[PDB]
Amino acid sequence: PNTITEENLMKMIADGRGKKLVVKSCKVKLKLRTAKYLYTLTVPNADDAKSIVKGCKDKVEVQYVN
Amino acid sequence: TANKTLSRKLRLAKKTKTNKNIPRWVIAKDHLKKTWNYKRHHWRRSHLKL
Amino acid sequence: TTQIEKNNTIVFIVDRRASKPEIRKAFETVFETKVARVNTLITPLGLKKAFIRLAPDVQAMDVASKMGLA
Amino acid sequence: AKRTKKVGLTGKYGTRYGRAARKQLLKIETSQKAKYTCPFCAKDKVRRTACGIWTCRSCSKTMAGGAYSLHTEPANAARATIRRLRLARED
Amino acid sequence: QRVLRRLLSRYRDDEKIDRHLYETLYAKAKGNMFKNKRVLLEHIVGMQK
Amino acid sequence: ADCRVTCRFHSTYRTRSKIVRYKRTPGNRLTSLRVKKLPNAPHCAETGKQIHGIPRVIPQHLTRQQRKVSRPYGGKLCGSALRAHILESFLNEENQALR
Amino acid sequence: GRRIRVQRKGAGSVFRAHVARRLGAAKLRANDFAERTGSVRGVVKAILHDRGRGAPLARVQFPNMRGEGRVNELFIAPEGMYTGQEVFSGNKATLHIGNILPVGNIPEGTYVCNVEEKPMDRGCLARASGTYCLVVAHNMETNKTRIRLPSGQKKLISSKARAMIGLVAGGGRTDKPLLKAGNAYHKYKAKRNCWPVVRGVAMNPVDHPHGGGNHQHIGVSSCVPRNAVPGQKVGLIAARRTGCSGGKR
RNA sequence: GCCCCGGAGGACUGAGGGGGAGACGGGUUCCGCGGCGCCUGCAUCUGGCCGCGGGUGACUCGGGCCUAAGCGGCGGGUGAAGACCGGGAAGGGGCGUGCCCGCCCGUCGAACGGGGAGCCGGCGGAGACUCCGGCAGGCGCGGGCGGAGACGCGCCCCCCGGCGACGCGCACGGGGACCGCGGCGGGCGGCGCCCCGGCCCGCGAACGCCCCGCAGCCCCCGGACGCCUUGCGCGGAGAGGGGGGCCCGGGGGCGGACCGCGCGUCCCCGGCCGCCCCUGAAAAGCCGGGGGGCCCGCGCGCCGUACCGACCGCACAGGACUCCGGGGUCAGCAGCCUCUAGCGCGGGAGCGAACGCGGCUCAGGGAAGUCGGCAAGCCGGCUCCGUAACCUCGGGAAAAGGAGUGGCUCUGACGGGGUCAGAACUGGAACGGACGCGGGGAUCCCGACUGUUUACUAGAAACACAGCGU
RNA sequence: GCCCGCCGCGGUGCUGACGCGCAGAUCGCUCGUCGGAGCCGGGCAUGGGGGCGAAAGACUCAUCGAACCGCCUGGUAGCUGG
Numbered sequence A: 001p002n003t004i005t006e007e008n009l010m011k012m013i014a015d016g017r018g019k020k021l022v023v024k025s026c027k028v029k030l031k032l033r034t035a036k037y038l039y040t041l042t043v044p045n046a047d048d049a050k051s052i053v054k055g056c057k058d059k060v061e062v063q064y065v066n
Numbered sequence B: 001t002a003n004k005t006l007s008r009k010l011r012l013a014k015k016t017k018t019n020k021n022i023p024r025w026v027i028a029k030d031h032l033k034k035t036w037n038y039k040r041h042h043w044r045r046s047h048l049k050l
Numbered sequence C: 001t002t003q004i005e006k007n008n009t010i011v012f013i014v015d016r017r018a019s020k021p022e023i024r025k026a027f028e029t030v031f032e033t034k035v036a037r038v039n040t041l042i043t044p045l046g047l048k049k050a051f052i053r054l055a056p057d058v059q060a061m062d063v064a065s066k067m068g069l070a
Numbered sequence D: 001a002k003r004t005k006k007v008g009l010t011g012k013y014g015t016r017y018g019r020a021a022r023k024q025l026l027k028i029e030t031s032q033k034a035k036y037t038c039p040f041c042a043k044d045k046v047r048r049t050a051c052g053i054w055t056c057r058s059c060s061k062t063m064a065g066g067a068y069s070l071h072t073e074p075a076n077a078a079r080a081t082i083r084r085l086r087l088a089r090e091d
Numbered sequence E: 001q002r003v004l005r006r007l008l009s010r011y012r013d014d015e016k017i018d019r020h021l022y023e024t025l026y027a028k029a030k031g032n033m034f035k036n037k038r039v040l041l042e043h044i045v046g047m048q049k
Numbered sequence F: 001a002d003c004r005v006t007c008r009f010h011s012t013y014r015t016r017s018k019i020v021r022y023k024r025t026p027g028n029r030l031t032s033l034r035v036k037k038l039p040n041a042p043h044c045a046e047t048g049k050q051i052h053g054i055p056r057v058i059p060q061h062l063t064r065q066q067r068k069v070s071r072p073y074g075g076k077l078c079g080s081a082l083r084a085h086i087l088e089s090f091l092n093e094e095n096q097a098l099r
Numbered sequence G: 001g002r003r004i005r006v007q008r009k010g011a012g013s014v015f016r017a018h019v020a021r022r023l024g025a026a027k028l029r030a031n032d033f034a035e036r037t038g039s040v041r042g043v044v045k046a047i048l049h050d051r052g053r054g055a056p057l058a059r060v061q062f063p064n065m066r067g068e069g070r071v072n073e074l075f076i077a078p079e080g081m082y083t084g085q086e087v088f089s090g091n092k093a094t095l096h097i098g099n100i101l102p103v104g105n106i107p108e109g110t111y112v113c114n115v116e117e118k119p120m121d122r123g124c125l126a127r128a129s130g131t132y133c134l135v136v137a138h139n140m141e142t143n144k145t146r147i148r149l150p151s152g153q154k155k156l157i158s159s160k161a162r163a164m165i166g167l168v169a170g171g172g173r174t175d176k177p178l179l180k181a182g183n184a185y186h187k188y189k190a191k192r193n194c195w196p197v198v199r200g201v202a203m204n205p206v207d208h209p210h211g212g213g214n215h216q217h218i219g220v221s222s223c224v225p226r227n228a229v230p231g232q233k234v235g236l237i238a239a240r241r242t243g244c245s246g247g248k249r
Numbered sequence H: 001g002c003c004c005c006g007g008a009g010g011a012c013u014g015a016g017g018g019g020g021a022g023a024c025g026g027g028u029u030c031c032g033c034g035g036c037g038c039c040u041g042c043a044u045c046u047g048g049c050c051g052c053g054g055g056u057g058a059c060u061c062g063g064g065c066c067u068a069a070g071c072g073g074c075g076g077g078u079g080a081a082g083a084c085c086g087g088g089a090a091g092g093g094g095c096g097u098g099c100c101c102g103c104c105c106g107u108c109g110a111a112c113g114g115g116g117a118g119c120c121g122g123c124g125g126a127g128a129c130u131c132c133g134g135c136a137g138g139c140g141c142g143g144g145c146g147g148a149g150a151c152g153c154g155c156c157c158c159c160c161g162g163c164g165a166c167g168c169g170c171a172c173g174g175g176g177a178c179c180g181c182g183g184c185g186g187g188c189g190g191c192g193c194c195c196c197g198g199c200c201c202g203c204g205a206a207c208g209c210c211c212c213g214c215a216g217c218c219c220c221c222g223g224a225c226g227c228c229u230u231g232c233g234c235g236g237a238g239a240g241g242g243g244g245g246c247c248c249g250g251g252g253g254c255g256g257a258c259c260g261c262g263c264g265u266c267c268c269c270g271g272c273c274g275c276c277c278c279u280g281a282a283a284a285g286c287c288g289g290g291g292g293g294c295c296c297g298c299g300c301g302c303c304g305u306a307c308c309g310a311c312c313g314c315a316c317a318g319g320a321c322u323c324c325g326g327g328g329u330c331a332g333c334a335g336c337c338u339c340u341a342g343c344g345c346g347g348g349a350g351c352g353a354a355c356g357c358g359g360c361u362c363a364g365g366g367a368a369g370u371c372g373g374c375a376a377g378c379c380g381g382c383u384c385c386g387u388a389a390c391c392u393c394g395g396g397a398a399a400a401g402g403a404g405u406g407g408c409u410c411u412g413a414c415g416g417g418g419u420c421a422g423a424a425c426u427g428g429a430a431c432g433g434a435c436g437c438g439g440g441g442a443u444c445c446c447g448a449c450u451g452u453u454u455a456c457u458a459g460a461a462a463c464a465c466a467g468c469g470u
Numbered sequence I: 001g002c003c004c005g006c007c008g009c010g011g012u013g014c015u016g017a018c019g020c021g022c023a024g025a026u027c028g029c030u031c032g033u034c035g036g037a038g039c040c041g042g043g044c045a046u047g048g049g050g051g052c053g054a055a056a057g058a059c060u061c062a063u064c065g066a067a068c069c070g071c072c073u074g075g076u077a078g079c080u081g082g
């Protein structure tokens, strides 16, 4: 597992390298399941809005909160 | 031992499988009065050298 | 039976001289299905047991039932 | 303050082995623990590492010598006589 | 001995005492001249004067 | 409490490649973890000192660039040994020829 | 009786030498074309301790004369040899400690070591620590050289037998007393199963010819003749004389 | 209600365990249900006994591979043979024909040595580093630049090297785990008086990226009465000072996903220093140098894996290798008590004779007993005082002999921590209050000394030994 | 190859227990040693008139001043029993 800067996150999505994304509410955790590593990005909810709209329609998103 | 060769395991496996009584229908079929199989063995008093 | 309803796995007795690659091919040709992974052991009596897990898109209930295992 | 009067380094032996042996060891063992001069370093840092084997702790050069001292008196004379025989070979 | 060396070095670095005084007291500490830290602080005063 | 553990290896004979350390797990448990032997790094062919720049990892696990130094005789000679070979070569040519 | 202790050692098993972790057999460089017509240059690589041996050994690297690469030799070290030193082997080598020369080219008076008793045999005389041979005289018409061995005997060898200049390092070793039984135990643990020693008179007659009796005593003379048979040849063998006396010169 | 099971009480083993697990050996003894004919030297409803069903899952753990000490093989050699002994032999490879290179064994020998790579959580009557879920790692297969410098950022053959790869030791230093004290959060117990004073729980892995790492080795300037350790050690073959590079089984931060402070203990690691007539394996495999020629998929076969001191002594107070190791008292892995965990040991009751076996105490005397002080008793921790003859000058030596020692209230010294020193008060005229723990001295004989021995009647004056001599 | 002392390794005295044993050599207390010629495990080597022995004629699978197993062998007995 590893962390990632936001700009690298879309490029992995942009090249179809992700398999599933999870949004976690606590500061929000976004977890992307690639072939090699699980990657985690932490942003405030203001920032995660725009990123998910950019979300690749070929990339399954799920949500999670409790 | 917990670390045994497959060849010793197979010969031990056969002594376990043949360690049995005469079936009761065999006693009726063959008309027997000796009913004990005297080739049986028990682990506490045996010396299987296998 | 618990092994089949969850874990999608069927337990078989096979000839001791068979390896995991021969077991996978045999089961795929006789029961017309898709194997995923095979584990094996030799029991204290000398028999070979195979743990046969079917592909994640097959129901071993559907395959055990047609065979009679249920 | 001086801790012994005569035995020196052979105080490690106690009352054992007799006077003649301990007298021999005091001389031998003082000699093999000594610091000798690098024939190359020119510094006083040569120590024994095994019987016959002497290393400068500054040069790092290794040398072949005596059992319990760097130079023996037979080898000094031999080197001196061999040198004069070579120079005599020169016309 | 760690206490006295730690104090002596601190002074030399601040130039309270020079290097030739530092080295003379360094050897006196190694030879059991001062019993604690207070005694060394008077020797330091007395040598400077 | 009671923190005693059992052996992790096939046998319990405590040789130099069967040393563990202890660690607390997220389920509140004391686990054993093997402590690998650390190989030396390569040493100079003339002086026997560690070559600078190479980590103490077996070279199978290091990328090609990580296993090298960027100089003639990069991982064989310690830098000072190179300079002494260079001078000996150049100066002997100056004395075996032209006096 | 039974077989006695000296009769059991010839059979091997527990009386074989303790050779594990030894560096190898120590020899001069082999005589070849280049050495016969000139000289070959080597460099001292290390000075090493050998198990079971008093003097040290030296590893010397020579160039390969029949191909590319290097050749590694194992010499008995003359005193004064040092790592990084340059040695020479051949007919044209000079007189310096460490060099290997034919004994006919060595002037009388010189100290030499590791001497061949026949040409090209790679050296067999004066090999132990502190020893040397002297070169006494040259007989040119018969091509023989006269040397003095460490025992003081004199001997004639060929003039083409080779030698190493100097004397063997490690000298003075025997002048330190072994203090304890334990120092003797460590010395022979590196050589052979030969220690400790039980006296013949301390045994029963079945075990030794000196055994038995109501007092410990030999009983007959301990001078046995030269033609005594194995099992019988104990004590002092073929002695010219016995006893302790001075006057020898 | 049975010696089985449950609840309550009373005790024991006492972290070198009657605890938790492996190696060897055993071989189904393992598990669930049933049962008492045999066995369980008493009983039984118990059970390692009897009947009937079941049970051990691996790319990552071990075996398979490498070599150790060894053991085999080798044109041949020898002997009546069986067999035993052995380098002097026209001894094989790369490819692609055709060229080129080449001196000559072993896919025998280690379930502790070497070795490419695994962690957490969960599930079952019996299996788990093996199953399931999650997160990784290894080995394969298919779709010429920067720097002043130390240093930083595809292959093939011949040669030169490296890693693998290594002894012992008193100490000193760093990390981890353990262990304590205090706070704060949640839960308990008992409570005649006292109690914010007692007890339990407060958890974070492998792996990936960034930062930080004492010693130690290296670079640049420049040119010296210093730098520095518990100890040492180092410097014109270039110190100190200023600024840098590399290694470091480690720590931190973000991922994976409660908060402080301390004395010790164990384990590993570091730099030194000491020691040897002792100098402390090898190989597979993998890599570098010089010279020459030139992201996405799929897979990982074979064997072991249950349980046990259930093993050997005809069945048994004997024998039987290793791993983990809390608290109090204390110099402590001693003795004595204890938290966790575990709970058999051919059976019970009554009486309180002789005599035995293991223990305790005895007035006055004190070896008169006896072959003989045999046995038993006296002494003993720590601190201070005080110590002879003789001697190989090292010893003798704890010589011999003396005095003090609890509790409580305080004071001083050392840079938060125990120790050391001193004083008042007090108690049958007591204090190493149990436990642990030398009796001493004057002599003669023998062997110098530590060491070895008649397994099962002899431990010595016998053997060995360094030294000396032939 | 120093001294007190735990485990370990050994085996002094009680001529203690036991001696139809817990046991074909054990148990209790006491005692030697405890950084070394020290102790322990696995692998390997030496074979019977032979081995191995810090030497006691000790040890060589409860066997040793010559092991064990089968055969020669129903060995011979001026001697004891019937």
Ligand SMILES: [K+]
Pocket (backbone or CB within 6 Å): B001, B002, B003
């Ligand atoms: K098993």
Ligand SMILES: [K+]
Pocket (backbone or CB within 6 Å): B043, B044, B045, B046, B047, H026
């Ligand atoms: K059995």
Ligand SMILES: [K+]
Pocket (backbone or CB within 6 Å): G001, G002, G003, G004
């Ligand atoms: K004989």
Ligand SMILES: [K+]
Pocket (backbone or CB within 6 Å): G001, G002, G003, I049
């Ligand atoms: K004989």
Ligand SMILES: [K+]
Pocket (backbone or CB within 6 Å): G001, G002, G003, G004, G007, G230, G231
């Ligand atoms: K004989």
Ligand SMILES: [K+]
Pocket (backbone or CB within 6 Å): G002, G003, G004, G008
């Ligand atoms: K014999």
Ligand SMILES: [K+]
Pocket (backbone or CB within 6 Å): G193, G194, G195, G196
């Ligand atoms: K011996």
Ligand SMILES: [K+]
Pocket (backbone or CB within 6 Å): G197, G198, G199
């Ligand atoms: K002797």
Ligand SMILES: [K+]
Pocket (backbone or CB within 6 Å): G201, G210, G211, G212, G213, G216, G217, G218, G219
């Ligand atoms: K005699």
Ligand SMILES: [K+]
Pocket (backbone or CB within 6 Å): none
């Ligand atoms: K039952």
Ligand SMILES: [K+]
Pocket (backbone or CB within 6 Å): H079
């Ligand atoms: K013949």
Ligand SMILES: [K+]
Pocket (backbone or CB within 6 Å): H078, H079, H084
């Ligand atoms: K033969």
Ligand SMILES: [K+]
Pocket (backbone or CB within 6 Å): H109, H110
């Ligand atoms: K092997």
Ligand SMILES: [K+]
Pocket (backbone or CB within 6 Å): H110, H112, H113
């Ligand atoms: K082994």
Ligand SMILES: [K+]
Pocket (backbone or CB within 6 Å): H110
């Ligand atoms: K192995």
Ligand SMILES: [K+]
Pocket (backbone or CB within 6 Å): H114, H165, H166
């Ligand atoms: K190794």
